Design a protein around this motif. Structure first.
Motif, PDB file in Angstrom:
ATOM      1  N   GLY A  11      -0.164   9.719   0.700  1.00 17.57           N
ATOM      2  CA  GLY A  11       0.090   8.384  -0.017  1.00 17.57           C
ATOM      3  C   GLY A  11      -1.563   6.986   0.550  1.00 17.57           C
ATOM      4  N   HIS A  12      -0.941   6.849   1.577  1.00 16.16           N
ATOM      5  CA  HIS A  12      -1.051   5.917   1.867  1.00 16.16           C
ATOM      6  C   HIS A  12      -2.117   6.054   2.969  1.00 16.16           C
ATOM      7  CE1 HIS A  12       2.539   4.041   2.119  1.00 16.16           C
ATOM      8  NE2 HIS A  12       2.013   3.505   0.978  1.00 16.16           N
ATOM      9  N   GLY A  13      -2.486   7.293   3.432  1.00 10.49           N
ATOM     10  CA  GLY A  13      -4.005   7.622   3.783  1.00 10.49           C
ATOM     11  C   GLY A  13      -5.263   8.356   2.596  1.00 10.49           C
ATOM     12  N   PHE A  14      -4.468   8.549   0.895  1.00 12.35           N
ATOM     13  CA  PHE A  14      -5.298   8.951   0.976  1.00 12.35           C
ATOM     14  C   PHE A  14      -5.813   7.652  -0.425  1.00 12.35           C
ATOM     15  CE2 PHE A  14      -5.774   9.777  -3.873  1.00 12.35           C
ATOM     16  CZ  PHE A  14      -6.353  10.683  -4.320  1.00 12.35           C
ATOM     17  N   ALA A  53       7.543   4.874  17.311  1.00  9.64           N
ATOM     18  CA  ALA A  53       8.103   3.921  16.808  1.00  9.64           C
ATOM     19  C   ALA A  53       7.100   3.559  15.578  1.00  9.64           C
ATOM     20  CB  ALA A  53       7.644   2.592  17.931  1.00  9.64           C
ATOM     21  N   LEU A  54       6.202   2.898  15.644  1.00 12.28           N
ATOM     22  CA  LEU A  54       5.712   2.787  14.012  1.00 12.28           C
ATOM     23  C   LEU A  54       5.836   3.693  13.048  1.00 12.28           C
ATOM     24  CD1 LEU A  54       4.194   1.060  16.659  1.00 12.28           C
ATOM     25  CD2 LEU A  54       2.812   0.759  14.140  1.00 12.28           C
ATOM     26  N   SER A  55       5.849   5.028  13.153  1.00 10.04           N
ATOM     27  CA  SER A  55       5.957   6.340  12.617  1.00 10.04           C
ATOM     28  C   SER A  55       7.349   6.147  11.460  1.00 10.04           C
ATOM     29  CB  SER A  55       5.882   7.545  13.162  1.00 10.04           C
ATOM     30  OG  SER A  55       6.243   8.598  12.214  1.00 10.04           O
ATOM     31  N   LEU A  56       8.867   6.085  12.254  1.00  7.51           N
ATOM     32  CA  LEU A  56       9.493   5.462  12.457  1.00  7.51           C
ATOM     33  C   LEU A  56      10.394   5.058  11.197  1.00  7.51           C
ATOM     34  CD1 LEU A  56      12.802   6.988  11.663  1.00  7.51           C
ATOM     35  CD2 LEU A  56      13.625   4.653  13.760  1.00  7.51           C
ATOM     36  N   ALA A  57       9.465   3.409  11.726  1.00 10.40           N
ATOM     37  CA  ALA A  57       9.178   1.976  10.689  1.00 10.40           C
ATOM     38  C   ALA A  57       8.444   1.870   9.728  1.00 10.40           C
ATOM     39  CB  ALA A  57       9.147   0.766  11.510  1.00 10.40           C
ATOM     40  N   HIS A  58       7.129   2.688   9.397  1.00 12.55           N
ATOM     41  CA  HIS A  58       6.797   3.048   8.347  1.00 12.55           C
ATOM     42  C   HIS A  58       7.368   3.971   7.018  1.00 12.55           C
ATOM     43  CE1 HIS A  58       2.928   3.251   6.433  1.00 12.55           C
ATOM     44  NE2 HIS A  58       2.879   4.489   5.802  1.00 12.55           N
ATOM     45  N   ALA A 106      -0.579  -4.873  -0.286  1.00 11.39           N
ATOM     46  CA  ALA A 106      -0.492  -5.382   0.444  1.00 11.39           C
ATOM     47  C   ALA A 106       0.271  -5.376   1.519  1.00 11.39           C
ATOM     48  CB  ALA A 106      -0.549  -6.483  -0.574  1.00 11.39           C
ATOM     49  N   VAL A 107       1.154  -4.818   1.974  1.00 10.80           N
ATOM     50  CA  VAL A 107       2.110  -5.248   2.585  1.00 10.80           C
ATOM     51  C   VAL A 107       2.718  -3.780   3.812  1.00 10.80           C
ATOM     52  CG1 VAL A 107       4.019  -4.890   2.727  1.00 10.80           C
ATOM     53  CG2 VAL A 107       3.895  -5.751   4.203  1.00 10.80           C
ATOM     54  N   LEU A 108       2.193  -2.966   2.593  1.00  8.96           N
ATOM     55  CA  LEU A 108       2.103  -1.316   3.177  1.00  8.96           C
ATOM     56  C   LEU A 108       1.193  -1.146   3.945  1.00  8.96           C
ATOM     57  CD1 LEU A 108       4.804   0.004   4.280  1.00  8.96           C
ATOM     58  CD2 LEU A 108       4.851   0.736   1.762  1.00  8.96           C
ATOM     59  N   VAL A 109       0.004  -0.612   3.622  1.00 10.47           N
ATOM     60  CA  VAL A 109      -1.365  -0.591   4.096  1.00 10.47           C
ATOM     61  C   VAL A 109      -2.359  -1.195   4.857  1.00 10.47           C
ATOM     62  CG1 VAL A 109      -3.308   0.922   3.302  1.00 10.47           C
ATOM     63  CG2 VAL A 109      -1.755   1.578   2.622  1.00 10.47           C
ATOM     64  N   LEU A 110      -2.444  -2.465   4.186  1.00  7.82           N
ATOM     65  CA  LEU A 110      -3.320  -3.341   4.704  1.00  7.82           C
ATOM     66  C   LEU A 110      -2.867  -4.374   6.639  1.00  7.82           C
ATOM     67  CD1 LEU A 110      -6.368  -5.280   4.919  1.00  7.82           C
ATOM     68  CD2 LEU A 110      -5.357  -6.118   3.318  1.00  7.82           C
ATOM     69  N   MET A 111      -1.281  -4.089   5.716  1.00  7.60           N
ATOM     70  CA  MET A 111      -0.998  -4.979   7.559  1.00  7.60           C
ATOM     71  C   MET A 111      -0.205  -4.292   8.235  1.00  7.60           C
ATOM     72  SD  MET A 111       0.396  -8.178   4.844  1.00  7.60           S
ATOM     73  CE  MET A 111      -0.551  -8.594   3.416  1.00  7.60           C
ATOM     74  N   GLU A 112       0.128  -2.993   7.736  1.00 15.13           N
ATOM     75  CA  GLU A 112       0.949  -2.357   9.164  1.00 15.13           C
ATOM     76  C   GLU A 112      -0.231  -1.226   9.368  1.00 15.13           C
ATOM     77  OE1 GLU A 112       4.215   0.109   7.556  1.00 15.13           O
ATOM     78  OE2 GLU A 112       5.252  -1.408   7.544  1.00 15.13           O
ATOM     79  N   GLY A 113      -1.494  -0.964   8.825  1.00 14.20           N
ATOM     80  CA  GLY A 113      -2.851  -0.442   9.510  1.00 14.20           C
ATOM     81  C   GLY A 113      -3.967  -0.935  10.344  1.00 14.20           C
ATOM     82  N   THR A 114      -3.489  -2.036  10.220  1.00 14.95           N
ATOM     83  CA  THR A 114      -4.209  -3.145  11.391  1.00 14.95           C
ATOM     84  C   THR A 114      -3.516  -2.928  12.592  1.00 14.95           C
ATOM     85  OG1 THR A 114      -4.954  -4.397   9.428  1.00 14.95           O
ATOM     86  CG2 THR A 114      -5.574  -5.776  12.081  1.00 14.95           C
TER      87      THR A 114
END
Lengths: 758, 199, 74, 345
Positions: free
Chosen positions: A397-400, A661-666, A706-714
């Motif tokens: 859904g986040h990639g969508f 790392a980032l996969s587990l934490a996301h 806000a925190v979960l697409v924009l701030m973890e995508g950058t």
């Protein structure tokens, strides 16, 4: 027929120009209207004031300076610059406009030099009025104060001072009048605009009572030494009313004189503010022509300018066509002004971009401009950059949502490339295809992780089977009735040991993908060395590094896949630990606790001694072949290359744990966000539950956008960028070269050039 | 004045008077440091080892990162081409925390559950001691290595902002200073080499 | 009533995602999926929460058709 | 060590001041400035350095040596004010202590101009805009030194420095103001030396101690070489002008205080090793400038130190003095002594 030059650079030529003097000025415009020649500086070791064409720079940038003074005068007395939108009779198809010839440039010079002093005296005339508007207006404020401002025990001084200096006034006058001061102040509410400076200067009035004559000169000098404007006000009420009636009809006369003195100036500025941009463009182009003719050799025995320039090979048929069109426009006879030169210099790079490979090229060029005819690193980056993003961003859904955000920018390209934006929407728009590929590959990765909004799918039958019956609260296990076709099984969802499988799963995923990326990027070094006819670099650098890092770290990957392929419970053998045997391969050789494959007690020792013997075989062949054909610099540089290539095998393959790392934490943060906000509103029967799930879904969508697409995508975006700058392009990317950047004509954007000067 | 030295002197005087009094009674072996090591749970030593390992490694990494980052940001005002070049001086400070991660992943595979019978056996006490000292060895070595590589990275950023030919000659010193964390890594893997799980 | 245009899209887009997402979640409450109610925790009844999630989807629909015509006026 | 806790506040300031330092002129750039014919050639040649586009938007015909030194000094002053704005704690204090030494010169200049009945606005310009202190133009009233001090100087940061200056109690002339100003600068250097000794960390501490030592020694030799003019000065009334800091105080300011002729000063400086290379040759001021620039060059080898601010300040001032001298020699057609600039880089 033009070569593509996306796998490597474009092939260059050095061309020497034999330009006569009488057509030189005219020919440099044609050389500038085609933007594909980069001129090299032939007049090196000649000082900047000793060169030819310096007074033709001094006159033209005097005109530039007067245009800067004009545009500074346009911001005061607010008038919008016209900005004539037709930036197309100089650009566009045809590639041929007639330059303005001589008398037009002299008209520009004498027009600006006539216009400047006129504007200077018109501005100086209307600023002698403001400095006598100001004191009359503040004196008019002094004259309306009642009696309570003028009644406390000529016997006083009165003035207007800025608010920043009232405390300093009263401190000094208390230390001077010894304690017999009757200071009093009332504030002026509006700021009082200054002319000699440009501060808005909150001011106030004051009054100081005393008796004598040497005392009033004392207070007066102290007051006006702190920049206070002192006045004379009568003690009686009727004298104050006579003075207030006298200042009116003098100040109103100044109102009448100010109009139609600050009006002809303004109408002149309305005349200048239209058709100033075209003047500025013409003068900047005329100045750039002489800046290009400055770097050419001047001959005196004949009037020929000699210039050199770099050019790609597919435009030698374009040069002769455009210069033939130029010598057909004006009737002359010149003998073959183009000559291709054979050189030993370093040509520029020039990769071609075509709107899809452009953003990734700008990505890879931010690190370094590649060597001439080296393999471009922007061609594999196109797909290896959003996929290494996608491993860390494994959600459906986040990639969508990221694809929807990308298609909001891709589906109107023509509307957006004509606007002025600023530094954030620029990085949004120039990388729209990057965001599109990142979203689509994140859809594929989040499908393989079986994760949509931190939930599972159930689109196939499971490979695990629950028992037949259980009490409510019994810890049970599943019985492995097959395998699941595409993705993780949905029987791992709650299961209270899902991390115990998922961590050892995705860590091995990250190690395997990192090794395949490194060993694919390493073969570009072989494809380089085979192209430059550099057969000593193969035998000295490719084979030692290949054997050293394959025999250590690809053996680990083969062991991971082989441990996956073998059923250990059916065979009745204990499953070994790959991390334990990787440590014991180096720290205790020969001893094996759990056996993986039959003759591995000797293979460990063989690979260890091969990785050992690749250490003196590196740092030896490349210097000592230079010796028998040591120098010190090659030897020390090769020792540095050996101590740097090794110890980056271990470090770089440890650095690919970030994909895990980032996969587990996301996944964990998205799961806590689902169970924290919207999971609360599922057991709330009533009319309160409707508004409860409305407000809590609003909060959940705002947080997951806000925190979960924009701030973890950058973050993961610049992690996929670190994995290509450091771990991937330290194996093939040589480094330094000079970028292409030809001489071309551009729009100049006046207010940038004013900030560039000041 | 000097409240911390007053605390240190007060603790010193109280410890001296207490130990001298336990002599004074004739009961000097009641301060039994060895019986404290037997009767203390080995999982405390193991988890302090793992947690202090990853914490001290991350602290050394952060220290080096802002030391070189402040100087690189300051030196890039006039010469903005130093950033993509001296990225590697922040790479060298970031790999320290990855070494701490590798040690934590190796050590956390040995935290099994033991029986109440033979809880304080020889192997379990050995495992607690080995994991504790190996964790704080690699953690303190990672801390010191991160500090040193950060200082050399700041100085390398200034020298490369002077002219471009100096960073190749100062990056060698970062290559010298970055091996020390790998030494701590190797000896931390070797101290806990023969330690078993908790059984 | 000053401008009211830069806040119209922020509510229309929010409602457009909200209708679809709560509609599919309510449809997954209705048919018992054994991943939304398949444990001893949060829901127990089944379609009794599908009821109010479809109600919230209807409320998002009227948010969407209200704010979607105010952006139409520009 | 010194690189541990420094960067937390001062790493950005140190990097920006090193970036300012990399734009100091080297020898080849001064030779290229020497080879200029007219003054517009000097403008165009300075345009290709760290200065460039600084005389843009001035003129092509209103270009004067005084205008060039005004703008080259204003660029220095804006850079110093930026670095002073970006600091806090001890570095902010340290830069205020750099400012106070120019505040003293502005005090002496304003009083001296007030004696000779000059204009307020004439003395308000050429009055070094870095040492401002808001109540400065009020020094043009009330000639008596007390009626300056009990009114305006107590609220300035120069208030603890007049502890010696109240001995004579009359109206001032040109020698009393210089005796006053020398006592000010003596008390000032000793205040700033005891500041550096107690708060600044160590590699900057030793560098600032040797730079302040040279400042005190230069002013001691200047007072000893200027005090043998037409007056009678008690050695007790002259040794209150030589600072108690430097490498020539423990015993060598004593022979400077007890000296009558030029040979007495030569015999006084004959035993200090760094000195007695100065008085037997030509321009005696250029030796102090050369030795100051060599000490400031030696201050740029320490990295974690705020001696870099002082060293860069003095180097950039010498650079402005060199460009002013070259511009004078170009504009006056006096090319015989154009190569007397002082360049160490």
């Amino acid at each position: 027929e033009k070569e593509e030059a996306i796998f490597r650079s474009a092939e260059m030529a050095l061309v020497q120009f034999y330009i006569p003097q009488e057509i030189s000025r005219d020919s440099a415009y044609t050389l500038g209207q085609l933007g594909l020649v980069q001129f090299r500086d032939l007049n090196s070791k000649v000082r900047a004031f000793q060169r030819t064409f310096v007074n033709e720079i001094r006159r033209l940038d005097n005109v530039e300076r007067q245009y800067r003074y004009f545009y500074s005068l346009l911001k005061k007395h607010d008038i919008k610059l016209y900005e004539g939108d037709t930036d197309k009779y100089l650009d566009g198809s045809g590639e041929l406009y007639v330059p303005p010839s001589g008398s037009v440039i002299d008209d520009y010079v004498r027009n600006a030099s006539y216009l400047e002093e006129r504007l200077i005296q018109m501005e100086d005339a209307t600023d002698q009025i403001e400095v006598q508007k100001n004191d009359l207006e503040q004196y008019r404020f002094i004259l309306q104060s009642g009696d309570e401002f003028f009644l406390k025990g000529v016997n006083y001084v009165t003035g207007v001072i800025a608010r920043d200096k009232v405390a300093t006034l009263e401190q000094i006058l208390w230390r001077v009048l010894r304690g017999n001061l009757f200071f009093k102040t009332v504030e002026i509410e509006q700021p009082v605009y200054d002319v000699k400076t440009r501060e808005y200067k909150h001011k106030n009035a004051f009054i100081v009572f005393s008796h004598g004559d040497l005392i009033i000169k004392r207070i007066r000098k102290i007051a006006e030494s702190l920049d206070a404007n002192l006045y004379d006000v009568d003690s009686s009420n009727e004298g104050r009313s006579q003075q207030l009636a006298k200042v009116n009809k003098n100040l109103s006369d100044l109102y009448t004189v100010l109009k139609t003195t600050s009006t002809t100036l303004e109408s002149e500025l309305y005349a200048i503010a239209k058709e100033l941009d075209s003047w500025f463009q013409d003068v900047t182009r005329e100045k750039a022509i002489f800046e290009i003719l400055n770097k050419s050799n001047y001959d005196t025995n004949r009037k020929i300018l000699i210039a050199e320039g770099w050019i790609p090979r597919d435009e030698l048929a374009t040069l002769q066509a455009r210069l033939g069109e130029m010598i057909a426009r004006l009737g002359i006879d010149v003998p073959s002004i183009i000559q291709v030169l054979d050189t030993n210099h370093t040509p520029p790079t020039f990769h071609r971009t075509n709107k899809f490979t452009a953003g990734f090229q700008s990505i890879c060029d931010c690190y370094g401009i590649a060597q001439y005819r080296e393999i471009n690193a922007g061609l594999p980056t196109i797909v290896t950059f959003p996929f290494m993003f996608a491993i860390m961003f494994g959600d459906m859904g986040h990639g969508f949502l990221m694809t929807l955000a990308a298609l909001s920018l891709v589906l109107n390209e023509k509307k957006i490339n004509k606007m002025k934006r600023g530094e954030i929407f620029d990085m949004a728009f120039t990388g729209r295809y990057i965001i599109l590929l990142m979203g689509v590959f994140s859809m594929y990765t989040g499908f393989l992780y079986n994760d949509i909004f931190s939930k599972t799918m159930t689109i196939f039958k499971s490979g695990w089977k629950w028992p037949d019956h259980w009490k409510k609260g019994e810890s049970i296990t599943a019985t492995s009735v097959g395998t699941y076709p595409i993705g993780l099984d949905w029987a791992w969802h709650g299961t209270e040991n899902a991390l115990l499988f998922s961590n050892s799963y995705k860590m091995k995923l990250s190690i395997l993908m990192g090794f395949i990326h490194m060993t694919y990027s390493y073969f570009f070094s072989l494809a380089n060395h085979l192209y430059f006819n550099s057969m000593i670099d193969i035998i000295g650098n490719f084979i030692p590094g290949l054997l050293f890092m394959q025999g250590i770290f690809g053996y680990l990957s083969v062991c991971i896949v082989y441990k996956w392929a073998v059923d250990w419970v059916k065979d009745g053998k204990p499953a070994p630990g790959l991390l334990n045997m990787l440590i014991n391969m180096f720290l205790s050789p020969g001893t094996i606790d759990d056996e993986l494959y039959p003759h591995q007690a000797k293979v460990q020792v063989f690979l260890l001694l091969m990785a050992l013997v690749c250490i003196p075989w590196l740092l030896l062949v490349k210097p000592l072949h230079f010796k028998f054909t040591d120098f010190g610099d090659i030897m020390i540089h090769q020792v540095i290359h050996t101590i740097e290539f090794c110890l980056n095998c271990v470090s770089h393959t440890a650095s690919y744990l970030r994909l895990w790392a980032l996969s587990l934490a996301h996944a964990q943060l998205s799961s806590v966000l689902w169970t924290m906000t919207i999971q609360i509103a599922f057991g709330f029967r009533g009319f309160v539950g409707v508004f409860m799930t409305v407000a809590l879904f609003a909060m959940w969508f705002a947080l997951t956008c806000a925190v979960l697409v924009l701030m973890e995508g950058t973050s993961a975006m610049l992690h996929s960028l670190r994995l290509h700058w450091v771990e991937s392009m330290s194996k093939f990317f040589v480094g330094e070269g000079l970028p292409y950047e030809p001489f071309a004509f551009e729009y100049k954007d006046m207010e940038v050039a004013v900030a560039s000067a000041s | 004045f000097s409240f911390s030295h007053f605390l240190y002197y007060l603790v010193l005087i109280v410890v001296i008077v207490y130990g001298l009094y336990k002599l004074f009674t004739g009961h000097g072996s009641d301060i039994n440091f060895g019986k404290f090591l037997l009767r203390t749970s080995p999982y405390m030593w193991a988890n302090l080892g793992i947690a202090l390992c990853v914490g001290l490694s991350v602290v050394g990494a952060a220290w080096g990162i802002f030391i070189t980052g402040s100087s690189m940001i300051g030196a890039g005002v006039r010469a903005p081409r130093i950033t993509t070049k001296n990225l590697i001086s922040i790479i060298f400070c970031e790999v320290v925390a990855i070494y701490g991660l590798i040690i934590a992943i190796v050590f956390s595979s040995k935290l099994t559950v033991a029986t109440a019978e033979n809880m304080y056996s020889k192997s379990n006490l050995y495992t607690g001691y080995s994991l504790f000292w190996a964790g704080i060895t690699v953690g303190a070595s990672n801390l010191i290595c991160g500090i040193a590589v950060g200082i050399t990275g700041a100085t390398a950023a200034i020298s490369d902002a002077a002219d471009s030919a100096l960073f190749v000659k100062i990056l060698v010193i970062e290559i010298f200073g970055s091996i020390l964390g790998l030494l701590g890594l190797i000896v931390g893997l070797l101290m806990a080499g023969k330690a078993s799980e908790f059984q | 009533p000053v401008v009211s245009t830069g806040k119209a899209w922020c509510c229309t887009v929010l409602s457009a995602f909200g209708v679809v997402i709560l509609s599919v979640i309510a449809h997954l409450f209705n048919t018992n999926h054994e991943s939304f109610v398949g444990s001893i925790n949060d829901p127990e009844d089944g379609p009794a929460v599908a009821h109010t999630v479809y109600l919230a989807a209807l409320v998002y629909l009227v948010f969407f058709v209200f704010c979607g015509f105010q952006v139409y006026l520009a | 060590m010194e690189g541990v806790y420094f960067n937390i506040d001062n790493g950005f300031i140190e990097g920006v001041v090193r970036g300012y330092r990399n734009g100091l002129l080297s020898n080849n750039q001064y030779i290229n400035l020497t080879q200029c014919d007219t003054l517009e050639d000097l403008k165009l040649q300075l345009s290709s350095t760290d200065y460039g586009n600084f005389l843009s938007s001035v003129s092509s015909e209103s270009l004067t040596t005084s205008l060039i030194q005004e703008y080259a000094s204003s660029k220095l002053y804006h850079e110093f004010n930026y670095i002073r704005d970006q600091s806090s704690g001890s570095t902010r204090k340290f830069m205020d202590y750099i400012t106070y030494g120019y505040m003293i010169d502005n005090v002496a200049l304003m009083i001296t101009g007030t004696i000779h009945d000059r204009d307020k606005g004439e003395i308000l310009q050429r009055c070094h805009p870095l040492g401002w202190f808001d109540t400065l133009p009020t020094l043009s009233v009330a000639t008596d030194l007390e009626s300056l001090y009990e009114t305006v100087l107590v609220d300035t940061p120069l208030a603890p420095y007049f502890k010696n200056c109240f001995d004579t109690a009359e109206e001032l002339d040109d020698m009393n103001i210089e005796i006053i100003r020398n006592k000010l600068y003596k008390a000032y250097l000793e205040d700033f030396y005891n500041f550096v000794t107690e708060e600044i960390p160590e590699p900057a501490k030793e560098c600032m101690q040797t730079l302040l030592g040279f400042e005190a020694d230069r002013r001691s030799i200047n007072i000893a070489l200027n005090s043998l003019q037409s007056s009678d000065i008690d050695p007790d009334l002259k040794s209150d002008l030589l600072p108690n800091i430097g490498k020539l105080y423990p015993l060598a300011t004593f022979h400077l205080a007890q000296a009558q002729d030029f040979e007495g000063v030569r015999a006084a400086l004959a035993n200090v090793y760094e000195y007695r290379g100065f008085l037997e040759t030509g321009n005696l001021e250029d030796h102090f400038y050369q030795l100051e620039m060599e000490l400031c060059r030696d201050a740029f080898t320490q990295q974690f130190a705020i001696s870099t601010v002082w060293a860069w300040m003095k180097s950039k001032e010498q650079e402005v003095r060199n460009i002013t001298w070259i511009a004078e020699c170009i504009a006056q057609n006096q090319r015989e002594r154009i190569n007397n600039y002082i360049s160490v880089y």
